[model samples]
Target: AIKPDMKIKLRMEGNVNGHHFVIDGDGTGKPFEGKQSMDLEVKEGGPLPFAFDILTTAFNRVFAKYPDNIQDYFKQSFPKGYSWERSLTFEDGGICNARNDITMEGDTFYNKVRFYGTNFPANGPVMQKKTLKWEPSTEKMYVRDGVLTGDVETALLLEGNAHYRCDFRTTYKAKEKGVKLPGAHFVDHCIEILSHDKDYNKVKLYEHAVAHSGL
Candidate 1:
């Protein structure tokens, strides 16, 4: 059901480093044909502010300087403009169609984003093909809406903690518009760095997506 302003929350769990790898079968391959990861951790009372703070801080440091970082990454993932932006508008008064927002509760920090017309069920398959990256030390992250609504598969891709054995890769593809350029294929690398559980006391997460109708 494509509600006018329905919000979807993605919950993540487990203390694992979801990594994606792009092997250079020919040795001299293009850039980003390697690895990446989204590291996550959880503490007893949720995540220590300092632990999860790094992600927000890192993103802020980069986002403040590179507002286009999100859009750039989008273009890389879907070079054909076959994403949600192609069909819908950013009705939420957001800067761009694709945006990132975060919230925190107790010892847990929640990261949320707005996608006006993204059909996750339809595009999710394609997205899964793209590489996923994450590096968690010991703290595990869990995504949920209310009370762990959907399973890992049903949730948005990369919305849940990555598998136990996986490597990270560039968010871009091989060729763009049938042209093989040096660094014109993909965009910014989607990454998340995490700490270990032993280092933290506990961590927790709750997901909730609230769709809006009008401004």
Candidate 2:
């Protein structure tokens, strides 16, 4: 379900050989079962392509990987062969702008993903020219009081104004209901972004979940 407060925008333009095309759509609202509409424009050799039916056919073929629902379409459409850009704004102040150069190498697909813009309250103290790498360890699970508890550790490496590393410990719990453990609920988590410089021992950024706090 699309959150009422969320906003999204996406655009794509590219050409394979001489076949040029543009795809534009509103990413807002609950996009389920092909409810989202797209505006497509194609230009062939001439100033305008003559047949509308042909243009529609080509558009469907190119976007066949997209899901029928608006919420699910982005998962497939995004990493495809199109020079695409997208912006997402959450109900919170968080925002993200993503750009991609998606190209095909004969039978294979190649994508270069970059975050040209990003702003989130959780990310404290912005840095210039930031590069990041994330690593996650294998999850450890155990059962207690008929509830399954899973624990995982993750690390984030940042290289920008200075080298830094952030460590995260996350936990989730799931309970069987009617013989099914449908989904796990996030229980607690903590994060600490640390600076490598000895002079800056203080934590650069931190987040923690407390008892009775909702994730």
Candidate 3:
């Protein structure tokens, strides 16, 4: 079951204005290598899964590796990194976007978690305060009408509108993490993940347009 406030993360690949994304690690490493530009969309509903934690972790991990110049690295990497001392939040608007209140309801469990915001604009900054709800949980994730459902009773709850759009984005570098060294070492990447064939197919329509547009 897909639950609200659940963290999610994934790598995505596709063409600009396109929908069909070849999920990283899902195979089909076509057009391998090189940085290809594409359009990306984040936050159709709430935040994406596990995206926030991954970024924070990455911040700490990077600084841990290079402690002395951690501030410098943040300055070079994030606009607000210079004085923040940590990647999680900064006085400047470089990190820590608006907060999102999520409600989850499901058969066995019901819970909700507030999350910071993030976004991945098309051809813009690779890293933004967008929401990611797809975390790499090995547990059997169930889906209905193409939307992943968190099995816990709380996963089914929706606060504002009971509807959520099919979230997706195109990838510039769509390969399994660490499969090949990426040119943009520190920047976070986005990948379009399909929870079901229906949503997957719906998003592909955008891909067709991108292909025709020469993206």
The candidate scoring highest on TM-score is 2
What lDDT tens digits, residue by residue, belong to model 2 across residues 17-110?
A: 2334453322222222212223332222333221121111111112212222212212233223334344434332434344555443333333
Candidate 3 structure quality by residue, lDDT tens digits, 1-215 = 32111222223332222222223111111111211222223324222322222221111111111123112221132211111111122212223221111122221111111223333344222233233332221111233343222121111112343311221111211112222221212222222333423222211110000001111
**Candidates sorted by TM-score, best first:** 2, 1, 3
TM-score of 3: 0.17
Query: lDDT values of the candidates?
Result: 0.22, 0.30, 0.21
Estimated TM-score for each candidate: 0.19, 0.23, 0.17
Native-to-model Cα distance after best TM-score fit, residue 128 in candidate 1, in Å:
35
| Global CA lDDT computed for model 2 | 0.30
Better of 1 and 3 by TM-score: 1
Instruction: For residues 107-181, write the lDDT of model 1, one tens digit per residue.
Output: 222333222212222233222332233333211112223111111111112335533222111112222354222
Off by over 4 Å in 2: 1-81, 123-215
Q: Which structure is stronger by TM-score: 2 or 3?
A: 2
Instruction: State, as a TM-score between 0 and 1, how close model 2 is to the true structure.
Output: 0.23
Cα error, residue 193 of model 3, in Å, equals 3.5
